[PDB]
Amino acid sequence: MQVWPGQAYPLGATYDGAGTNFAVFSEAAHRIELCLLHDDGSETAVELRETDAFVRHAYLPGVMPGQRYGFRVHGPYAPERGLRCNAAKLLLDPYARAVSGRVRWGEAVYGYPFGRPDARNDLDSAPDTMTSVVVNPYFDWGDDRRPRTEYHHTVIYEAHVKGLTMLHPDLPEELRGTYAGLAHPSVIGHLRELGVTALELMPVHQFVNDHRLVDAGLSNYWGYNTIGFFAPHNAYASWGDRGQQVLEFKSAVRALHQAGIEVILDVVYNHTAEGNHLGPTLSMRGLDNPSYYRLADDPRYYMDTTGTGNSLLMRSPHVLQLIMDSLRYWVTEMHVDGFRFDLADRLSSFFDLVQQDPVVSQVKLIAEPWQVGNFPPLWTEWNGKYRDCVRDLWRGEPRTLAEFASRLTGSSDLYQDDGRRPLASVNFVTCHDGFTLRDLVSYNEKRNEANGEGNRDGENYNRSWNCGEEGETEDVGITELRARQMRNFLATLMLSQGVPMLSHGDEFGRTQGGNNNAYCQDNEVSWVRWPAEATLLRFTRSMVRLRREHPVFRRRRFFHGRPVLTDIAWFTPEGEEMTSRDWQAAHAQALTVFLNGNAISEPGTQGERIADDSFLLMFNASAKELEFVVPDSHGRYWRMVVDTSDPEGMPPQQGPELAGGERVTLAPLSLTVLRRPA
Amino acid sequence: QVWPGQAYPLGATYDGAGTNFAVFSEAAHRIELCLLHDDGSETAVELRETDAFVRHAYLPGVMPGQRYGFRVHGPYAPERGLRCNAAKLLLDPYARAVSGRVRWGEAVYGYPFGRPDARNDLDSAPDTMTSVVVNPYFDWGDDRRPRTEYHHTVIYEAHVKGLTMLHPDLPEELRGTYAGLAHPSVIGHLRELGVTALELMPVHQFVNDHRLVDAGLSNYWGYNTIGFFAPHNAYASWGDRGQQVLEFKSAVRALHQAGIEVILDVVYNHTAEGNHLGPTLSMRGLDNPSYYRLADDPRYYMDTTGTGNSLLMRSPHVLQLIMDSLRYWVTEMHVDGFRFDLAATLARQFHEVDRLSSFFDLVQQDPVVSQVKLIAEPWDVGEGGYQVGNFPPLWTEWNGKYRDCVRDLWRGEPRTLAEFASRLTGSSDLYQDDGRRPLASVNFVTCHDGFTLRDLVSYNEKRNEANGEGNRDGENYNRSWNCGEEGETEDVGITELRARQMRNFLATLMLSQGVPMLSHGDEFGRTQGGNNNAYCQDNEVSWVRWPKEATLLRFTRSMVRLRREHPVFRRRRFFHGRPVLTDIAWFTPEGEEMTSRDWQAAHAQALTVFLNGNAISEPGTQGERIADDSFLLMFNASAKELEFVVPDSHGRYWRMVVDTSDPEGMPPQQGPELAGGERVTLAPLSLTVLRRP
Ligand SMILES: Nc1nc2c(ncn2[C@@H]2O[C@@H]3COP(=O)(O)O[C@H]4[C@@H](O)[C@H](n5cnc6c(=O)[nH]c(N)nc65)O[C@@H]4COP(=O)(O)O[C@H]3[C@H]2O)c(=O)[nH]1
Ligand SMILES: Nc1nc2c(ncn2[C@@H]2O[C@@H]3COP(=O)(O)O[C@H]4[C@@H](O)[C@H](n5cnc6c(=O)[nH]c(N)nc65)O[C@@H]4COP(=O)(O)O[C@H]3[C@H]2O)c(=O)[nH]1
Ligand SMILES: C[C@H]1O[C@H](O[C@H]2[C@H](O)[C@@H](O)[C@@H](O[C@H]3[C@H](O)[C@@H](O)[C@@H](O)O[C@@H]3CO)O[C@@H]2CO)[C@H](O)[C@@H](O)[C@@H]1N[C@H]1C=C(CO)[C@@H](O)[C@H](O)[C@H]1O
Ligand SMILES: C[C@H]1O[C@H](O[C@H]2[C@H](O)[C@@H](O)[C@@H](O[C@H]3[C@H](O)[C@@H](O)[C@@H](O)O[C@@H]3CO)O[C@@H]2CO)[C@H](O)[C@@H](O)[C@@H]1N[C@H]1C=C(CO)[C@@H](O)[C@H](O)[C@H]1O
C-alpha cells in the first residue's frame, strides 16, 4: 500500500483529490501509527515516519473522504512524569473536520486499569470511541456575503441548536432539533421579525456525553465538554455523521446569511472532554499530555481552574496554534461571523495572536469575563454587572438608582478609561446561565433537583422576585404583575446603551420550572415551546423596533452630559433636575431620564450628522403609584410610546399626547417612555 | 470631505474611490493626518474616530501618489518616556512607499541640540522622508513560488546595488537597482551558478546615519530600518512615489520565472531613530513607550549591542507590525523567506526566552509566515542569548560554527579534524537532539560580515581604517591565513596557493550536509582590500567587478552542479553510521579505520571520508528509494604532500572527479580512474574526491 512522505502542513487530514495528507503533532511520541478504519471493524495501520518539528506526517494516495481514521501513539506511560501515552487507544485527530459515532462507556476508553489509577490498560478503544473522518472541503457558497452588521445595529439572540427547533410545528420531524432546522424559513422568519441580527449558538463543536450524566439518566445538553474543536457536533445533524454534518452546518450558515443574520459561535477552549486523571483517553491525553494540559504540582493530576476536570496549557505553542487554526477554520471555511469565549501572563500570547490575526481580529470577539472590564479594547464583554443591577432595580434593592443610571448609559465606569465605547457592553437580563426571563419573575430560589447534584449546582444569588408566590399561580394579580415585570426587563434592555442580548424563548415566556442551570436537561424543561405569549411577542418585536429606529438608544460615544448643548439630563419624578443629594435618598426608586436626539455627535458612514427624536424615560420601581411631571415647556408636547403597565402591549399600542409640566401617574414597578420630536 | 472609515488594516489603504488611513498610538491626545502638496504646503485633517487606540478616517478622492504624514499632539515628558511632538511630520510605520531622504539638521530631532530633555519645536516636514499612498495593483500572471525543498537549496547572498552596479550588460539606468536584478544577464548568471535562492541584504527602507553622512560615508548595507513595509527608494531606478514598489515586484516576478526564490534579510530588532539623541522620524513621536524597550530611567533606551534602540518584542502592536510586515512581503511582494536577526541586550533580570516567546508563537502558527523559509542568525558565541543550535525546530540557522571550523581546518589549526567531521556531516551535535534535520544548518565560509573569500586567504588581520572607527569595527579574529604575504602579491607561488585555497573552501562547502550559502562575488574572487566590515563603503571597495571563462567561476559552477547531481551530499537524515548497511566511514590517509586515538592526535590533519550512495534511507516525494553513486573524500589539510591509499577491495575502480590542486579546475576537468589499494599523493592543502557507481 502506497505511502509517501507528504507534508507537515496543514495539520490534520487534507484531501487533495487523489489522496490525503495526514499530519499530527506530538513531541512525546516515540512512534505514531495512522490507523485506517474499515466499515467491517478491521484496521490498516501505516506509520507516520516523516517527522518535522515533532509533527509526523504521511500522504496516502487513494484515501478518500468518508474514510475513518485515528492515531496510535507509541510512547512512555509514566504518569509521575505526566506521560499517559497508550497505544491500545485509537486517538481522535484534534484537527478532525468531522467526527462520527459516540462514546460507549466501558473500560476500553480509559488509559488506566480499573483498579489502579497509575498503571496501564490494554484493551482496544477503537470500537467504543468516536472516530475522525476525512472530509471533502467543497461547498458552493454562491453569493454568500458576511453581514458585517456594526455593533450599534446589533441585537444578539442566544439560542440552542436543538432546543430552538425541537418542538417547532412547521418543520418536518427529521429537521427538528438539527442544523438544517435552523435553515428552515419559519425559524429564519421568526428571527427576522424579532429584529435579531446575530444568532449566537450554544456550543456546536463536537462534544462528549459525560459518563457521569449518562450513568444518571441525563445527558450533556448544553455541550460545554468539547472534544472536537474543528467538527460540528454530530448529534445536531440529520444528514449523517461521516462528513454530512459539515455540509449541514455550512448550509445553515448560508441560509442565515441570505437572511442577513450573523452566526456567532460559543466556543469552549478552556477544557476538553477528557476530564481529570480518572477521565477517559480519547485524544490529547494519549497524544502528548504535557504539551496540551496544565499539570498539577504532582504531574499525575490536572489543574482544574473551572470545575470541568482539566485546563488547556495556554502557553504551549501547539495549543495556541490549534485554537487559532480552529478560529480561522470556523470563520474562513464555515463562514461564521464571531465568537463568544470563556477563558476561565498566561493569556498574553493568546491575546497577541487574536489581535494581529487578519481574519480573527476582524470578526466579533465577545468574552465572558469571569475580569469585568479588563479584556483588551478590541473585546466586547458580557456585562454581568448590568444584569445584576437591572435585576436589583425591579426587585426593589434599595440603593440601585445611582448604579442603574450608569448601566443604563453604557457603564462608563467600566469601559471609558480603557478607551472603549459603550458598544463594548453586551447587556442582558437573562441568558442560558440562570433563570429564564419568566422564571426570574416567578421564583425566589432555584429548583435544580432534577440535575442530580442536590441543588448544589447553579447560581445561588439570582436577584429574583417571585412577585408574591413561589412558582405557578392562579392569582390574576400576580400573573399580571409578572407579565409587566417581564416587560420592564425587556424594555430596560432595549433602551440601554451598549449591545443587547436576548435569550431564546424569552419572547414567548419560556420556563424551565425554576431550574436555573439546565445543562443536563435535553427534554421539555429546556426546549422552546412554540406558541398571552402573543402580547409578550408583540411587545418584544416592537421594543426591538423602537431601538432599531432610534439612534439615541444605540450611540457610538458615551453621553457628554452638561458642558461647563446638553445631551442627557436626570430629573426627579416631580420634575426637578437631580442634585448629588438626590442620588443617595434611601427610597429613591424613581427617575426621569431625558435623552437629547438633537445632540448625537458621532457622524454616520459618510460623515453625515445623525439626528433623532428625543425621549423621556420614566422609571417607577417603588411599590406605590407615583405622579411624574413631564419636565418641559407647557406648550411642548410628548407622545407616550412605551407604557409597561398596559396589559395589551404599549408598544405596539400607541399612547396619548402629554404637555410639559403635566402630571402623569405611573403604576408601581412600571416604565413609560415619551417621544417629543425635536 | 472626511468619513469615519475603518481602523483596519493599518496604514493608507486605497480602494479606487479614495483612501482609508489608520494609525496606532496609545499616548496621543489628538492625531492629525497631514497631506503634503508639491509646494511644501499641507492640508491637515484630524483622525477623530478611535478604536482600541487606532485613529482612523476615510478620505474620498485621495489618490495613489499622495504624500502624507502624521502629527501627534500628546505629552512631551522624557522622564516618563513620552516623546510626542506635533512639530514633527512622522512617517506612517505602515507606509507602502517612502519618498525622499533625511536632510540632517536640528529640525529632525525632538530635542534642542543643547538640552536633551527639552522640546524642539522646529517643523520637520521640509527635512524628513514622507509616506506615499500606493496603488496595490500588479499582474503577477503565471507567477509560481518555486517552493524549493531545503535539500535542493543553494543560497546566494547579494547586495542589490553592489551586485549589478558594475555589470557591463546593463544600461546605466539599471545598474545597482531592483530593475537591474531582473536583467536576463543577471538572472542568467545566477541560473548557471546553480543558485536556487537569492538572499538580498536589507531592502526595507532605511536611513543614511547622520554620523556617516558627517564623515563622507553613508549607510551602504542598510541595517538601519525606518520603513518595514516599503522597498528602499535609493535602489529604485523608476522613482520613489510608488514606482519603487512596482520595480521590486518586477524583480521578484522575473526571478520566479527563472525558478529562483527571493529571501529577504530583515532587521526588526531596532530602528533608525537610534537612542535618545537620535532623530524623531516615526515611532518615537507616535508612541514611544509602546514601540521601544525603555531603560529603568525611561528617558533612555535599552539597546541590542550598539545599534541605539531596541523594539519592544512583548508589545502587541510591535508584534502586529512585524507579522503584518512579514505577511505583506510574502503575500503581496511574493518573497519566499526571511533571514532574521532578533539579537538584543537585556538587563540581567529579563531573559530572551520570555522576550521572544510570543514572537515565535506568532510565527509558528501563522498560515502564511510559517510556510516560507525561516532562517535565524544566532547570538554570537560569547554573549549568549539564542546560541546556534537553540532556535525552535521550525527554524533553520546560519551555522557560525561551520564557518569557524572549516576556516580553522584549512588554516591548519591544531585539533580540528574531530569538529570538522561533525560540521561536514550536518552538525549533529547542534541539531540532532532538538529533533531537527541536517538541513537546519545553513553552512557558509564567508558572508557579508567579515572577509570575502579572496580576502580570507589574503590577509591575517583586517584593514577597516576607511570605515572611520579607528579599526575598531568588525571582527578581530578572522581565522585567516594570507598564504605567505599580507595583501596582494605578484609571487606566482602564493597566487597558486590562494587560488587552490579558494577552491578548498568552495568544495568543502558544496560537499557538506546542510544548506550551502554563497557570498556574492566569491565566484569572481571579489576583494574588499582587506576591509572586513564594509557597511559604510558604497563604492568600489564593495561593488562586484564582473569579468570579461575564469577558472574559479568554472570550478564553482561545476561544484554546485556536482552537489545538485548527487543526493548523498544533501541528505534529509543524519548519517546512521556503523550499526545494522554502513552509510559513512572514516579512514586515515594510509587507509584504515579511524580509532578514537586518531581523532585527537596533534598530527591529525588529513582524512578520507566514505559516503555510501546505496545507503540513503529517506524516500523521495513519491516514496521511492533514493539512490546515488558512492564517494571518497580525501582531505589533505596538512602542509606537506601526503600519500593516500584508496580504502576499497582489490579490484574496484573509482573516478577522480574533484582535485583542487589542478589549476585549470577539476571539475569541470575530468581526472583518471584509480583502483582500491592504490597509493596517490595529494598536494599540501588540497582536496580530492573519488566517485564509484
Ligand atoms: N526531524 C527529523 N529527523 C530525522 C528523521 N529521520 C532521521 N532523522 C534523523 O536521522 C537520523 C538517523 O535516521 P535513521 O537512518 O533512519 O536511523 C534512526 C531510525 O532507524 C530509527 N528511528 C528514529 N525514529 C524513528 C521512527 O520514528 N520510526 C522508525 N521506523 N525508526 C526511527 O532509529 C535511528 C536513529 O534515530 P535518531 O536518534 O532519531 O537519529 C535520526 C534522526 O536524528 C525525520 O523523519 N525527521
Ligand atoms: N476633537 C476631538 N475631541 C476629543 C477627542 N477625544 C476626546 N475628545 C473631546 O473631549 C470630550 C471628552 O472626551 P472623553 O473623555 O474621551 O469621553 C469620550 C469618550 O470616552 C467617548 N468616545 C468618544 N469618541 C470616541 C471614539 O472615537 N472612539 C472611542 N473608542 N471612544 C470615544 O465619548 C465620550 C464623549 O466624547 P464626546 O461627546 O465627543 O466629548 C469629548 C470630545 O469633545 C479627540 O480625539 N478629538
Ligand atoms: C464537569 C462539571 O459538569 C457540570 O458543570 C456544568 C455547569 O453546571 C454548567 O453551568 C455549565 O457551565 C458552563 C457555563 O454554562 C458557560 O456559560 C461557560 O462559561 O462554561 C461553563 C463551565 O464550562 O457547564 C458545566 C458542564 O460542562 C457540573 O455542575 C459540575 O459540578 C461538574 N464538575 C464535576 C467534575 C469532577 C471532575 O471530573 C470534579 O472536578 C468536580 O468537582 C465535579 O463537581
Ligand atoms: C550604529 C552602528 O553602526 C555601525 O554598526 C554596523 C556594523 O558595523 C555592521 O557590521 C552591521 O552590523 C549588522 C550585521 O552586518 C548583520 O549581520 C546583522 O546581524 O545586524 C548587525 C547590526 O545591525 O551594521 C551596523 C550599522 O548598520 C558601527 O560599526 C557601530 O559602531 C554603530 N554603533 C554606534 C551608535 C551609537 C548610538 O547611536 C552607540 O550606541 C554605539 O556605541 C556606537 O558605536
DSSP codes joined into one string, A322-372: HHHHHHHIIIIIT---EEEE----TTHHHHHHHHH-TTGGGSEEEE----T
Q: Please return the burial class of A319, using the count of CB atoms within 10 Å of its CB with bins 0-12, 13-18 and 19+.
A: buried
For residue A88 the three cell numbers come to 491500545
d(CA A664, CA A118): 74
Q: Can you say whether residue B250 is alpha, beta or left, with left for phi > 0 and alpha for psi between -120 and 50 degrees?
A: alpha
d(CA B458, CA B401): 22
Give the distance (Å) from ligand 4 centre to CA of residue B224: 9
Q: Give CA angle at B76 (B74, B77), nearest 5°.
A: 130
For residue A465 the three cell numbers come to 422576585
What is the amino acid identity at position B622? Q
> At B486, which helix (H) or strand (E)?
none
Rounded (to 5) percent helix, strand, coil in chain A: 25, 20, 55
Q: Give CA angle at A620 (A616, A622), nearest 5°.
A: 165
Mutate to test the interface with A, among B15, B25, B326, B365 (most CBs of A within 10 A): B365
Half-sphere exposure at residue A142, Cβ-oriented, CA atoms within 13 angstroms: 7
Query: Nearest residue on chain A to B328, judged by CA atoms?
Result: A358
The three-class DSSP label of residue A431 is coil
d(CA A201, CA A179): 11
d(CA B690, CA B613): 13
- Strand partners for B692: B630
Q: Are strands A364-367 and A380-382 parallel, antiparallel or unpaired?
A: parallel
Query: What's the 3-state SS for B515-581?
Result: EEEEECCHHHCCCCCCCCCCCCCCCCCCCCCCCCCCHHHHHHHHHHHHHHHCHHHCCCCCCCCCCCC
d(CA A519, CA A213): 10
What is the amino acid identity at position B109? Y
A260 assigned to a ligand binding site: no
Selection from A462, A412, A407 nearest residue A433 by Cα? A462
d(CA B601, CA B639): 16
| Count, residues in chain B | 693
Query: What's the 3-state SS for B202-221?
Result: CCEEECCCHHHHCCCCCCCC
d(CA A549, CA A547): 6
- Cβ atoms of A390 and A492 closer than 8 Å: yes
Q: How far is CA A614 from CA A226, A560, A562, in A?
A: 48, 15, 16
For this PDB entry, the determination method is: X-ray
Mutate to test the interface with B, among A1, A349, A375 (most CBs of B within 10 A): A349
Residue A408: count other Cβ atoms within 10 Å of its Cβ: 26
- DSSP letter at A313 equals -
d(CA A586, CA A92): 60
Beta strands in A495-536 (DSSP E): 499-503
- DSSP letter at A529 equals P
d(CA B125, CA A50): 57
What are the residue ranges of helices labelled H in B273-389?
283-291, 316-331, 352-365
- Residue numbers after which chain B is interrupted (C to N above 2.5 A) read 548, 580
Smallest Cα distance from B577 to chain A, Å: 20
Contacts with A456 (C-beta within 8 Å, 6 or more apart), sequence order: none
> At B431, which helix (H) or strand (E)?
helix B428-431
Number of helical H runs and strand E runs in chain B: 14, 29
DSSP codes joined into one string, B359-394: HHHHHHH-TTGGGSEEEEPPPPSSS-SS-TT-S-TT
Q: What is the largest CA-CA distance in chain A?
A: 92
- Please report, for chain A, the start and end positions of each structural domain, with discontinuous segments joined by +: 1-136, 137-557, 558-678
From the CA of B206, the nearest ligand is 4
The three-class DSSP label of residue A568 is strand
Instruction: Give the resolution value in Å.
Output: 2.4
> At B294, which helix (H) or strand (E)?
none
| B362, B436, B620: residue with CB nearest A353 | B362
DSSP codes joined into one string, A395-415: HT-TT-HHHHHHHHTT-HHHH
d(CA A213, CA B127): 73
For residue A290 the three cell numbers come to 504535557
> At B194, which helix (H) or strand (E)?
none
Spot the catalytic one: B377, B538, B583, B628. Answer: B377
Q: Would residue B341 show up in a list of annotated catalytic residues for this protein?
A: yes
What is the amino acid identity at position A572? T
For residue A66 the three cell numbers come to 468518508
Residue B149: count other Cβ atoms within 10 Å of its Cβ: 12
* Residue given cell 591509499 in the structure block: B645
Positive/negative CA dihedral, B5, B6, B11, B17: negative
* Residue given cell 478532525 in the structure block: A96
- Cβ atoms of A630 and A572 closer than 8 Å: no
d(CA B93, CA B226): 8
- Put the strands of the sheet holding A68-74 in their side by side order: A43-47, A31-37, A68-74, A131-133, A99-100
- Put the strands of the sheet holding B130-132 in their side by side order: B42-46, B30-36, B67-73, B130-132, B97-99
Contacts with B657 (C-beta within 8 Å, 6 or more apart), sequence order: B562, B666, B667, B670, B671, B689, B690, B691
For residue B359 the three cell numbers come to 514572537
* Residue given cell 589542478 in the structure block: B662
> At A603, which helix (H) or strand (E)?
none
From the CA of B267, the nearest ligand is 4
The three-class DSSP label of residue A500 is strand
For residue A557 the three cell numbers come to 460615544
d(CA A222, CA A432): 9
- B73-109 burial, b if ≥16 CB within 10 A, otherwise e? ebebbbeebbbbbbbbbbbbbbbbbbbeebebeebbb
| Count, residues in chain A | 678
Chain-chain contact of A352 with B319 (C-beta, under 8 angstroms): yes
Count contacts between A and B (CB, < 8 Å). Answer: 91
d(CA B503, CA B521): 14
For residue B448 the three cell numbers come to 557579508
